[PDB]
Amino acid sequence: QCRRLCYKQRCVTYCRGR
């Protein structure tokens, strides 16, 4: 599934699966 995550300055989306 897709969730949003931030790299303590940056913010991106994480969609799991392959």
Swiss-Prot record:
Name of the featured protein: Gomesin
Q: In which tissues is it expressed?
A: In hemocytes only, but not in all hemocytes observed.
Disulphide bonds annotated for this chain are C2-C15, C6-C11
Arginine amide-modified residues are: R18
Q: Where found, per UniProt? A: Secreted
Instruction: Using the record's annotations, give every residue carrying the modification Pyrrolidone carboxylic acid.
Output: Q1
Function (record text): Active against several Gram-positive bacteria such as Bacillus spp, Staphylococcus spp and E.faecalis, several Gram-negative bacteria such as E.coli, K.pneumoniae, P.aeruginosa and Salmonella spp, filamentous fungi such as N.crassa, T.viridae and yeasts such as C.albicans. It is active against the parasite L.amazonensis as well. It shows hemolytic activity.
Please state which portion of the whole protein this structure contains, as first and last residue out of the total length.
24 to 41 of 84
